[PDB]
């Protein structure tokens with residue numbers, strides 16, 4: 001609704017930085033509303049959903065097992081590893097690592113998972129091969145969050161990300177049981193509460209993944225809808241703001257309040 005765009009563009013004004021926004025119909029793929037939808041933004045941790053998509057694609061292909069155990073150690077740990085730092089002695093399974101990566105945004109979990117598929121370059125190849133000729137991962141944690149102005153490394157566009165998320169969650173790309181496991185990880189959350197979830201009515205479904213990086217970068221990808229069933233995808237990104245985390249969070253939550261009101 002154009003009234004939601006009143007709020008999106010106000011966010012860009014208030015944050016002093018670009019905002020990108022997409023609302024898509026999940027079933028049809030229709031673009032319901034957008035703003036800077038084909039401009040690049042840093043993915044930040046929103047890539048972790050894509051990553052676990054690529055992992056699940058390998059599982060489906062008999063190239064990976066969700067129960068396979070990976071052993072790691074102190075030196076592997078990178079900044080912000082709230083789950084993996086607890087499991088050095090006895091390791092974690094691939095499903096446990098995707099759970100940690102998506103539900104907690106654990107950064108070491110993401111690196112461990114990235115290693116399984118061949119690194120960033122292979123995530124990019126996976127994306128290209130599913131018809132996303134835009135999104136690219138180039139680096140590992142921590143550097144992929146650096147959000148350098150004009151850098152295309154580690155970026156997506158709102159439109160590409162929304163399209164790709166629709167494919168992963170609902171297309172023949174993954175088997176049913178696996179696309180369900182991807183959305184189930186996304187339904188769990190300990191870190192995106194201040195974002196769309198804070199605006200979500202009782203009884204509604206959401207499956208999401210947030211991101212935060214350098215230079216004010218912040219974002220979220222989500223599938224949401226009423227009565228326990230998702231029916232739209234929303235993607236919001238911003239980069240370049242000098243605002244506080246709370247200020248960026250609130251702008252995203254206010255975009256969410258608006259898109260709910262005008263649903």
Ligand SMILES: *[B]([O])([O])[C][N]C(=O)/C(=N\OC([C])([C])C([O])=O)C1=[C]SC([N])=N1
Pocket residue numbers: 044045046079080105107145210211212213214215
């Ligand atoms: B992902 O974008 O969710 C991973 N995020 C990070 O590594 C960053 N922040 O994460 C915490 C520590 C949870 C936070 O307080 O937002 C991060 C990377 S670079 C930067 N300035 N913040």
Ligand SMILES: [K+]
Pocket residue numbers: 031032033034
């Ligand atoms: K429109």
Ligand SMILES: [K+]
Pocket residue numbers: 071072073088089090091
């Ligand atoms: K170990």
Ligand SMILES: [K+]
Pocket residue numbers: 086089
């Ligand atoms: K221990």
Ligand SMILES: [K+]
Pocket residue numbers: 102103185186187188189192207208209210
């Ligand atoms: K989530």
